[model samples]
Target: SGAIYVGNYRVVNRHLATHNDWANLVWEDSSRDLLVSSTTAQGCDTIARCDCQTGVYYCSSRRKHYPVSFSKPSLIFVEASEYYPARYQSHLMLAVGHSEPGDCGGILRCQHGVVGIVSTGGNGLVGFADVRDLLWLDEE
Candidate 1:
């Protein structure tokens, strides 16, 4: 028999209006690729990706939007832990994440200020969570 190896796990409080009852926030690799996955009432699923270095984030669905076909759930909330470079002490994180009703628009909150109350290049809506208090540690 094989054993199950569960990787790093963290649960985030779901505090947004959407069909999905649970939302997960995770860092995929050492590069800090942020990912979010969740389920929706319409039997659709979604994944949102973010690149901290480039300051870019977007969402994609598993289903096509059609009257008969269910539209995938959009990412209406986002949160991230503080990321500190191994050599630096400055803490950095994303601001906001929210999704539009039809997945036609989105929003992002960065350190500079609020952005993307308008269309976000065909991505879904957005909202953000504050992770300033979360600390980061280097694996030694």
Candidate 2:
């Protein structure tokens, strides 16, 4: 006979939307205790594309982007590893160099607004998901 064991978890009200292989999770917590209440800069309007030479910043668990300038969009190279699994092979992504390691999922934003999310990086080159085409739902 087979059995299953579950781990501890919390059940929070949330909604997820996906488009063009991109997904955005929206938490519907009535308490609104601690979620990203603001994705904009202290003085910004809305999200904008990462144009060449446009400066942007990012935030990770242990580090914050002092300031990373957007350069261009290029392919993210991934090499086969013996211990780690290969994720993407030459995937097209935003090419913003000078990002730190383990900065995946970091929020990338600029004076305009949130730009994208960190994907992966190496060789003094970093890649991110351009959030321009993602579907957005405004809340009141």
Candidate 3:
């Protein structure tokens, strides 16, 4: 029911999901150590839990058994919308997200000022819900 700012993007609807509902979250910081999620040091490594279902993570139990419980969502719910950049500049720019196959998450692009193309982002370019309810991160 809330959002947190991560780098140049914004993380929305980060409620503590039940174990059964946490599987759809995006492991925002999971790719830190080795600069990628699924890849790690040759022998042993721990990674962020992104891309899963019915669980709050995608970690290797064999590596992190009995791990301390954390209070963050591995997956996030970024509803379809035209959300503006978090710290908008008084200029124009096109900030796009990463994409692989069908995963086109993070669509942060816009122009700013008293009047501009403020809010925007969603995985793809089709069938997005109403952006009317979306809280636009605008400079207006």
Candidate 4:
């Protein structure tokens, strides 16, 4: 039971969950890849486990973003590779999870920073549009 920093405000509530609850949590094993589940309790636990120095404020009356994990300098291959290989170099951002095809367009927020824009991936493997690149785009 505590308050978590959601956007500019810290809302207080009972937080209950654990890494075990985040069934998708992975490590070195193929099945142990760092993944997250889309549940409020598990989300809360995820945030609790986050390093204070690390880690979105999504606009939603019924939903809010929570930090599940953060991985920088991460790369991911998208779609069929044989037909056409496409790769995206960006940070690996995870969250509390959201409904498919509905969580896009939300902002990925870090500590007092707008990390990126939700672009691709799902089930907590969220792909974000790097803010740095966006700034570079503005420079052009």
Candidate 5:
């Protein structure tokens, strides 16, 4: 599989709505509790969870990006690896890059869902891999 580029909030929201039917969904008490429970049980210390007034749960384990100037554009590149045996599935990797308003740029790598920023002279590149792949590594 190829990489999926998620641009901005608008694009992300639209994608979530299409996949999760955010427009027509109603949360029940049990569902809310389940969501809370599942999030707590995940054991990902770096994960973030937020519950909206509507009882919708938003969970993201990805690290937060540093504040960039409005003129800067954050670029995230995702690429999927080739499939292996039944025990090993293809994984997605992300390369994140950012540039200051008029300044140069920086790069970073999202290792094991954690982002580490690099201040090299090259273009700011952020790299991330899908959590599923990381989890699959322990299946054997």
Candidate 6:
């Protein structure tokens, strides 16, 4: 539910995409005003992730990230207790080091971080990407 060490560097879940996706998707069905919601809003701990058109910062877990115009600019971690019933052991694979040039137009980029809760558990679980790592989406 927090940061985990992956041999060398530590990693944490910058839970953004899924949070906003559910927010807006469900908000579309809402009869409420701007949700103005952040996953951090639901719970309190100290963490953040950021994407910028005007900037790029590590969005460190040192605190919270603001001015999130795109992709719900936040790095959140949701533990098993936060949700409903049983906790399923969700397997995770994360980079042991850092990211080089990747996503957005160079200035804008990511695919972000995670380690502990999504447990690789140890060295053997770490590998290249696979289908289960992806979220298959469909809408009616």
Best by TM-score: 2
**Model 2: per-residue Cα lDDT at residue 107:** 57
Query: For model 5, which pairs clash?
Result: 94-128, 95-126, 96-125, 96-126, 97-124, 106-124, 107-124, 107-125, 108-125, 110-127
TM-score: model 5 vs. ground truth: 0.19
Alpha-carbon RMSD to native, per candidate:
15.4, 12.5, 18.7, 16.2, 17.3, 15.5
Higher-scoring candidate on TM-score, 2 or 6: 2
Query: Whole-model Cα lDDT per candidate?
Result: 0.25, 0.40, 0.21, 0.36, 0.21, 0.23
The list of candidate 5 runs beyond 4 A from truth reads: 1-92, 95-122, 135-140
Tens-digit lDDT string for candidate 6 (1-140):
23322222222233212454444332211110011122222222211132222222222222322221122212223133322233222232233322221210111123343201222212322111111122211111
Q: What is the lDDT of residue 65 in candidate 6?
A: 29
| TM-scores for all predictions | 0.22, 0.47, 0.17, 0.41, 0.19, 0.19
Q: What residue runs in model 2 are displaced by over 4 Å at the alpha carbon? A: 1-46, 49-53, 59-62, 81-96, 135-140
C-alpha root-mean-square deviation, candidate 4: 16.2
Instruction: Give the per-residue lDDT of model 5 (tens digit) for 1-140.
Output: 11111111111111112433234332212110100111111232221122111111111222334432111212233232221112211222222343222211122222222221121112554222222212221221
Candidate 1 residue-wise lDDT, 13-98, digit = tens: 22222233223333322221222223222221112232222233333332221111111223332233333233211112322343
lDDT (10s digit) by residue, model 3, range 18-134: 342234333322111001011111312122223111111111212221212221212223332332223322122122222221221212211211111112233521111111112
Which should have the higher lDDT, number 3 or number 4?
4
TM-score of 2: 0.47
Candidate 5 — what's its lDDT? 0.21
**Candidate 4 pairs with clashing backbones:** 26-32, 26-33, 27-32
TM-score of 3: 0.17
Give the Å error, residue 113, model 6.
10
Ranking by TM-score: 2, 4, 1, 6, 5, 3
What range of 10 consecutive residues in model 6 has the weakest lDDT sum? 28-37
Residues 50-140, candidate 4: write the lDDT tens digits. 2322344352323766654545535554443222335443333444445233444455556545454454454545554333322221221
